[PDB]
Predict the structure of Beta-N-acetylhexosaminidase.
Amino acid sequence: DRKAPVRPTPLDRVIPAPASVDPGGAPYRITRGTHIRVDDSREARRVGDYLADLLRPATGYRLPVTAHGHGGIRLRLAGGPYGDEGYRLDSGPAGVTITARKAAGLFHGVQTLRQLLPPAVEKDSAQPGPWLVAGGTIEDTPRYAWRSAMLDVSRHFFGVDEVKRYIDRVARYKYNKLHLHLSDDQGWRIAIDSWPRLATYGGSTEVGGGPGGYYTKAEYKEIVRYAASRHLEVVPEIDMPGHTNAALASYAELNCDGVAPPLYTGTKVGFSSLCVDKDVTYDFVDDVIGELAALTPGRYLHIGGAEAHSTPKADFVAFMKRVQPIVAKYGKTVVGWHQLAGAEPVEGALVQYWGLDRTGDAEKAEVAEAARNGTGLILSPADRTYLDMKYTKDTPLGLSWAGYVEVQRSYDWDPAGYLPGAPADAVRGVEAPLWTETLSDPDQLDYMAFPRLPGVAELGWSPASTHDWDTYKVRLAAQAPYWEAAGIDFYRSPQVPWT
Ligand SMILES: CC(=O)N[C@@H]1[C@@H](O)[C@H](O)[C@@H](CO)O[C@H]1O
Ligand SMILES: [Cl-]
Ligand SMILES: [Cl-]
Ligand SMILES: [Cl-]
């Protein structure tokens, strides 16, 4: 009875593990006449409609969303110790009630609810159910405020609809930020009015050659809107001064020798660099950041800064000293890869650490020192959360430069005591980046993203006290029938006792 269990799945069997789970009493059962009761507000109905849309296909129920009556499923905004993202979920014969202070909390409660329901809920045609929800109470709040997923749309371009699909994949696990890697050596993916060729030429191809693509400002705006409806704050990244061949190939004047390099379709890194000694370089950066900031309602702007191997150390420092202020000029908070820690991060900046266990102490120290100086840390170790890394030497896709990364390794660590010498309070959260040198279609993205994606979300959300591989793997194994029913391909790791 894998697809449609006789009894409801345990109230605690969800990912991320909730802060508090108190099972008790009989379950709730959604039936044909169930109404979704919400408060009389736009944001309330919004979450209500979102839930109805997720349930209507598999149940074949009407599931009206209204601001009156005593609906079997109620979403209510009220006071409580749930913060901006937490919620309380009560379940029993009397119905299911999700209470929170804000819409994001109700949304997160919905993500928990869809896991309490059976795998059949993922189907597109009416199913028999039963639509059971374990009885009891769940009180949930997040450990970290920065819980993100990155999608590389530069190595291989993914259109608006494919990005929306990935957004829905991550929304399942309460991620709250979407990092979009909009530019690299193989492509520039955002139209900039002041430099039209960046998109039309710089975005004309991708890894492996052939058609590439890019987002018009309208398309980017739609991605931001869709992400916002899924409570994901979009963090756009324009990598600099390295990983800039797409831009360099589009405008000869940006190159130190004044010659535009060919469009790049390979998979190597670290060979490109903006020309630090030219004034035009900074007019370019200002124009791009200014236009990107205007399209970004979010608080952050990622300027990258990693693998600028064609940029002398002194030049890199000088470059970052000059460009960081540009971000604040346009009202945003700068974010950069941890190499920025070696280039005097400005006040309020955050750095994304992608180091490994084997990274030298000197490099780790530089980042820990930045943390001591007030720089926020986003943890995404290359040998832990880089979703493009192979599970084993036999994985058909992905890379292996950071060694192999099985499911347990990706999950089995604690952000608070990860980087030696770094103050725990400097850790803002975690991120799971999905690079695309080897991935060209949505299904391939799924195979490399799952099953490690839920694990990184747990690290960002769950209390350290709930962290345990032996019990976590059981909750992860439980996702199998859901992904199968939803058509989500995933790596059936031998470390997980799949249900
Ligand atoms: C922070 C950063 O720039 N990461 C680079 C990225 O260009 C590449 O796609 C990925 C491969 O796993 O890891 C590094 O080589
Ligand atoms: Cl999905
Ligand atoms: Cl090459
Ligand atoms: Cl390389």
Observations:
- The chain has two domains: 143-463, 1-141.
- The domain at 1-141 is CATH 3.30.379.10 (Chitobiase; domain 2).
- The CA atoms of residues 98 and 307 lie 45 Å apart.
- The first strand starts at residue 20 and ends at 23.
